[PDB]
Backbone:
């Protein structure tokens, strides 16, 4: 049995081989106990503030919303140590691994930001860490491979399947299923089997909590909507969580549309796939008619995953959150716009969320709205990718 | 499920265990696959464990991953596996047939509909690798409604609650996990005598050991320990891989290995 | 005449062609007036907090000082938007250019961090910006070239001379001498003619001010010493300034030793050069016996400059600050050590300061000391350089 | 400094201005340089402005930067420039000789020692490009002690305080800056008549216009405006650059250009 509900409505669960159930129950118990331990919370807070640099800025864009009644703020997770929001929950999971007595870490990564975060946290806290990365993503996110290597982590390129995030995830779990007495699997997003979706949300909720406190201080009211890109769902649930009971606040999740939904080359199973069971959870999947898990596609490695965390499927199902998609080309234009008009170089992942907020502004420019975009990371890892595209155009 | 009971009641009257091979269906092609399976049975397989090609076999190491990929290259789909299964049953009326499934293929077009189709083609049991006992309810219920034995894993880290649920919910045979990890002949299997005894105490279905069985010594060991038999999937698929261009010598090398394995169980 | 003293003892002054004196006096007057304008200070504070992310963390390293009586804190300027301390004073100088009514920006850059900072600030505040970079540094710091380009700035590679920082500086000033009615020259370090050394120090002093406030809160006492790398001198004077009247606090500046002082291939004129007049100031210079300005050398582009700001020459002369050097190899070992044992990838510039604090610890490990290292920037721009070295060794 | 006064008092008695060429000393080699300078004087130079190769000529555009680099390639050092200067003075006893210096070369071995050496070799004035009037004290004092005219720049953005300091402190000639920017024949020069009048009002030294003078029309313009003359450094060095392999045609092309320039001043 479990201490906490493993499902969000129909979505979620623990679909792993029986061998891994003691590992999941152990982690769940460690989490529940740690959330009650003021000494674990103080240590977590200490790392977040003094090591990662929280709280992050909330930046008001004045140039990009000119001539419109949109006020746009960016939650600056790009300024966090490591360059993205991934760092937040990795500090918490590293403390949990140590609370359990574990000594090794396994992790999967696509945009390499979660791998970088797992490697830096393991180096700080004295854990031996190994990261699985898809050989395609080794290439398109290569600044992060050597960052990982520099920090004492072992990086394992994954040539299976699409050689992207989902293939890394499969090797990660295969490995954990034969390492778990000593290693903790530091899953990088709010997906996978229970308790990961719950843990990852609680270890990222400071995104939404700070945003709430900061907008009230600056604007005296809640935002009309908060907007985040949705890979597995960690930064968006971290932004959403503290607003879920504020029913006036729209929660907008942005899936990668890739080359266009109609092409089939996208990463939007929440709206364009079908519920399936894979990676330990019941959740929307991109899949063939006869149940084979399909390959996803995004220009952004960090969104190039063919499922989504179960809490997002549930928030969608009851109407509490709305999900949309943004294509590669839209995400590229949003990247350029932020660089040239706000002097922030955003991750191509976050650029999807920016691109949707700009669409909300442009489509209805006399509508009064206060929007927050979760700027989930910086785009240094993307500049070569973006270079090669812009040069092939002009 | 009544084929397993009939088997074990005759295996024991002959003072031997069961040797159950595993292969992927359609590896390396539909029609060579069938002659692999006919050759396993004629060489002395007591029952079969049969995998349906899946896009993400997360309990399987590279040997069986490659089996899966070979079947995909052959264009082998689940619907073609079920026509294969019907031909195997129509050739082999008493041989118990178990499937190794992943949850998504069972859930894809309806859990009940999946088990309805298993019954239609003559499957005797279904093991769903990524479904623990905690999530097993709809799988075990649909299996029982269509007379399919739901196979449960007894792991080496089994506590007592697990033993008693597996014992009560399972039919056909209880799966004795050799070790942690994924399938592979590379990693050989802790002694499992104690779990075997507890399972018998609680009227579990009879126990077969799997994960890592690669040599005749391993097989006799498990029946020596009071288990009912052993399963070997890889070291069997590697014989298949070894002879992709050598179909004739593939089957002879298989036949040799199998009651080499079966004899160890007598 | 001037409103403020242009010299620090014998060092400093305004050694520019007569044509540029009205530009310097204008900037000085604008600065003096802005420092009295609570509305300019509020706007500056707004950008620093909400846009750049100040205050930065003060991180205590626990692993690297183990087995010693040294407590080492790192002032995390690497977490500032842009990736280094350069961003602080560029926001102030951008506000000054706008206060003056200017509309274009000129800047020079070596490690490309100042160019990146000038480009992002110009994009945010609506200024047209052009940056001069040495063609050698284009190469060894290439992640920053396209960052600059992405943000709407014009980047001009400098093949003259050593094709490094000092050559960029010469083109910058040549250009300003014929653009100054419309462009403001945004000099990137605490050097050059008055008023730049003073302005750059006051626009970076929040480094030392925050460090003082943070160490008192965490340790209840001032540090025994603060340690910073010294290119032109901006991050070190920003760290030092608020401690100058705390005479118990040691102020340690670290020049690049390059391949070894005895090789002549270094960037340490403060200790190993001779006073000269160049780049508009009287300051220690590396130069030939007959007065030609010599070429400097550092593994770190950001320290590869053959002079130093005049306030550092003065603090040295009266004994208030001490200056030392750290070689390429020492700086490389400090880079590796921070990556593997604290999970921070530091700029090769800052690694020089880290390397000296580690020497202070290692040489006298039973000495009780509280040290702060100015972590002037992150090392993402350096990972390729460092890769190619470590691979040529092992 | 008394050579400049003698000159201007005879230029004016002949109703003309002065044409003062600039070259870098030792560009493109010591001994070709001397024959350039002898050729400038025989072609009609009234005085000379002579640059000493410096590692960072920040008031100079690419033409003269390249002049500097050519002299460095020739191995030309300051000490060799001063031996050149002595030979030029010993050949040309009445031609005023001014140096264009950068501050570091003057300060390197002592400000007073630099001006002592200028006097020893017969230099008449020194202009230090990166020293404004605000930092000029030790330079102007050492110059006056060794009978060297300190040359001050009157810029086009000159306010009144500047005019009156330049007027009082300067000797020899006042330098009339044509424009902002760095040296170059590329950028041609705002009319400067007004500054000329104020300078005369305050007993300034006589005024020569420089920075951008490239054509005979430009030269007659400046003397037309009541100035005393014009300086052309580039468009002269480019003739030098043009004919690196053509030393003979270098000098003829120079001679042609110069009293082409000088005549425009009559
Ligand atoms: O000989 P090997 O190493 O290839 O191992 C035998 C594997 N063949 S199988 O169908 O029994 C088999 C049995 C259980 C599996 O997963 C689970 F344990 F999680 F349920 C997967 C495959
Ligand atoms: O013909 P050009 O364009 O080459 O201009 C003439 C330049 N030759 S020079 O020695 O008089 C000369 C004069 C003044 C200079 O700098 C200063 F104005 F800042 F003082 C530099 C060179
Ligand atoms: C998959 C990865 N990146 C995820 C990511 C994402 C998508 O992951 P989540 O949906 O879990 O936030 C969004 N933004 C940034 C900057 C990201 O790096 C990874 O680093 O492995
Ligand atoms: C010269 C540059 N870099 C300077 C630098 C320095 C040296 O500059 P200052 O001495 O002015 O701080 C130190 N640390 C970092 C991260 C730096 O980028 C430049 O970006 O142009
Ligand atoms: Cl519960
Ligand atoms: Cl349910
Ligand atoms: Cl809590
Ligand atoms: Cl294990
Ligand atoms: Cl609250
Ligand atoms: Cl690039
Ligand atoms: Cl048989
Ligand atoms: Cl039973
Ligand atoms: Cl003063
Ligand atoms: Cl003085
Ligand atoms: Cl102030
Ligand atoms: Cl101008
Ligand atoms: Cl205070
Ligand atoms: Cl690399
Ligand atoms: Cl003559
Ligand atoms: Cl006079
Ligand atoms: Cs902060
Ligand atoms: Cs607006
Ligand atoms: Cs996705
Ligand atoms: Cs210590
Ligand atoms: Cs330096």
Residues:
């Amino acid at each position: 049995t479990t201490l906490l509900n493993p499902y969000f409505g129909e979505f979620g669960g623990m679909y792993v081989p029986q061998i891994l159930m003691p590992a999941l129950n152990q982690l769940e118990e460690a989490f529940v106990s740690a959330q009650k331990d003021p000494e674990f919370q103080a240590q977590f807070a200490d790392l977040l503030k003094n090591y990662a640099g929280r709280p992050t800025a909330l930046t008001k864009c004045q140039n990009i919303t000119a001539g419109t009644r949109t006020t746009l703020y960016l939650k600056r997770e790009d300024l966090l140590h490591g360059g993205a929001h991934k760092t937040n929950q990795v500090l918490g999971q590293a403390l949990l691994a140590k609370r359990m007595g574990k000594s090794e870490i396994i992790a999967e990564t696509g945009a390499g930001q979660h791998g970088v975060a797992s490697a830096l946290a393991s180096a700080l806290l004295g854990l031996k860490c190994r990261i699985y990365m898809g050989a395609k993503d080794v290439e398109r996110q290569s600044p992060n491979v050597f960052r990982m290597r520099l920090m004492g982590a072992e990086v394992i390129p994954v040539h299976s399947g699409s050689a992207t995030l989902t293939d890394a995830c499969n090797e990660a779990l295969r490995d954990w299923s034969g390492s778990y007495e000593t290693a903790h699997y530091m899953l990088g997003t709010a997906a996978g089997p229970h308790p990961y979706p719950t843990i990852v949300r609680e270890f990222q909720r400071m995104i939404g909590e700070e945003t709430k406190a900061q907008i009230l201080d600056k604007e005296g009211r809640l935002p009309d909507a908060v907007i985040a890109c949705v890979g597995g769902g960690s930064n968006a649930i971290g932004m959403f969580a503290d607003f879920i009971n504020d029913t006036s606040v729209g929660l907008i999740g942005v899936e990668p549309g890739g080359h266009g939904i109609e092409t089939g080359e996208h990463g939007a199973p929440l709206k364009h796939g079908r519920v399936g069971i894979y990676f330990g959870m019941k959740a929307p999947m991109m899949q063939t008619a006869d149940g084979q898990i399909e390959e996803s596609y995004s220009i952004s490695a960090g969104l190039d995953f063919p499922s989504v965390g179960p809490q997002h499927a549930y928030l969608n199902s009851i109407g509490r959150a709305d999900y949309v998609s943004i294509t590669d080309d839209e995400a590229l234009e949003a990247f350029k716009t932020l660089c040239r008009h706000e002097g922030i170089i955003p991750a191509l992942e976050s650029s999807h969320a920016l691109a949707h907020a700009l669409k909300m502004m442009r489509e209805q420019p006399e509508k009064e709205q206060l929007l927050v975009v979760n700027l989930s990371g910086r785009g240094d890892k993307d500049i070569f990718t973006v270079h090669d595209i812009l040069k092939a155009r002009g | 499920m009544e084929r397993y009971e009939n088997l074990f009641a005759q295996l024991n009257d002959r003072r031997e265990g069961a040797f159950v091979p595993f292969v992927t269906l359609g590896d390396p092609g539909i029609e060579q696959s069938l002659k692999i399976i006919d050759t396993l049975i004629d060489a002395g397989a007591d029952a079969l464990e049969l995998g349906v090609p899946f896009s993400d076999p997360l309990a399987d190491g590279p040997t069986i991953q490659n089996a899966n990929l070979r079947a995909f290259a052959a264009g082998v789909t689940p619907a073609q596996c079920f026509e294969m299964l019907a031909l195997i049953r129509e050739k082999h009326p008493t041989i118990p047939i178990g499937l190794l499934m992943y949850a998504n293929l069972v859930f894809n077009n309806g859990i009940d509909a999946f088990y309805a189709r298993c019954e239609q083609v003559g499957v005797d049991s279904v093991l769903v690798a990524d479904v623990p006992v905690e999530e097993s309810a709809p799988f075990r219920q649909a299996a029982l409604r269509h007379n399919i034995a739901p196979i449960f894993i007894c792991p080496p880290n089994a506590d007592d609650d697990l033993l008693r649920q597996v014992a009560s919910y399972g039919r056909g045979y209880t799966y004795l996990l050799s070790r942690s990890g994924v399938t592979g002949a590379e990693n050989r299997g802790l002694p499992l005598h104690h779990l075997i005894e507890k399972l018998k105490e609680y009227h579990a279905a009879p126990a077969l050991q799997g994960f890592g069985i690669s040599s005749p010594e391993q097989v006799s060991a498990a029946v020596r320990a009071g288990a009912a038999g052993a399963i070997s999937g890889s070291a069997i698929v590697k014989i298949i891989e070894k002879n992709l261009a050598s179909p004739k010598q593939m089957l002879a090398e298989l036949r040799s290995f199998v009651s080499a394995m079966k004899a160890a169980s007598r």
